[PDB]
Amino acid sequence: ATTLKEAADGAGRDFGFALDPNRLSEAQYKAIADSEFNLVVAENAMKWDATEPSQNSFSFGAGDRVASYAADTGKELYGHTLVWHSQLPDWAKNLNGSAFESAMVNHVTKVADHFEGKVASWDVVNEAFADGGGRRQDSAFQQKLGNGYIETAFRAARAADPTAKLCINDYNVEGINAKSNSLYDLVKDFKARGVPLDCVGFQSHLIVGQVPGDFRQNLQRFADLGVDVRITELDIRMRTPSDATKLATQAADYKKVVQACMQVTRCQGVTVWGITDKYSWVPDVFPGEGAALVWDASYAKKPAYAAVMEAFGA
């Protein structure tokens, strides 16, 4: 393998990235996008704010640009995300009861129908659970609709798109803990009752030096419920600026995560949350943290690059 794309291809797995379609006009970004990945997800372009800015009025230009990019370069297209408490427009937050449920169902239906036959898998529901266990405590969906909204979203997604793989996605669920246990209970329940659900995403927003040692075991127990598993938003952030020690640890951490996936037969692959540190979400949310991705801010391969290639068995 001369690229991460080749390494993942050879491993029979996906290696993806989070795309900002506006950055496609930056040729270096596009070069790496084109050559290093076999899967793409919209970083923002297919979220509710980006697709339904007013009630039942849709803005698919940006999402279409992502879908077209995937089709033009022969990459799998992963959909993110139909139902999520964040990046939810004020008009939706202002609705209540059945009016709110209807806006959710309509959102799921229209977006899934629009991308049907293009998007292969959806994050139907994103970040439904709470650190420490149970349901998320600051969600419009949880508050207005209660426990049943997850099942409602999945069934609506399947009604719109009979064949797309329908995933639930979350973070801080990589290890076995109260959060991943709650997620596990739901997945088992849905499979038991025949609720449409095909996959589970593990965001893997990790901190350098802190990869859960039970990650493989956790992925395996989910896979054994009869669903596929995927690492969906991998980045491994550090205190900036980087140095040799931090970059070495980060490389080892990337290797650990990719190996965990390689060790689980139903782990579809790994998607990193961006290409270059230049554009990563991390520094804006975590002051003084960053350098979380595989390429630095000048597009140089970091040691993480070799680690990923090695982990895919290249």
Ligand SMILES: O[C@@H]1[C@@H](O)[C@H](S[C@@H]2CO[C@@H](S[C@@H]3CO[C@@H](S[C@@H]4CO[C@@H](S[C@@H]5CO[C@@H](O)[C@H](O)[C@H]5O)[C@H](O)[C@H]4O)[C@H](O)[C@H]3O)[C@H](O)[C@H]2O)OC[C@H]1O
């Ligand atoms: O106006 C919009 C504008 O909002 C966007 S900016 C956009 C914001 O969304 C991000 S994607 C981002 C990916 O991470 C997930 S999970 C995230 C993780 O961090 C937690 S703290 C957590 C605690 O425990 C630690 O050990 C663990 O490692 C930590 O991660 C945080 O609370 C949680 O939210 C996140 O939810 C999600 O927002 C995009 O990349 C940005 O671009 O741009 C478009 C504009 O129109």
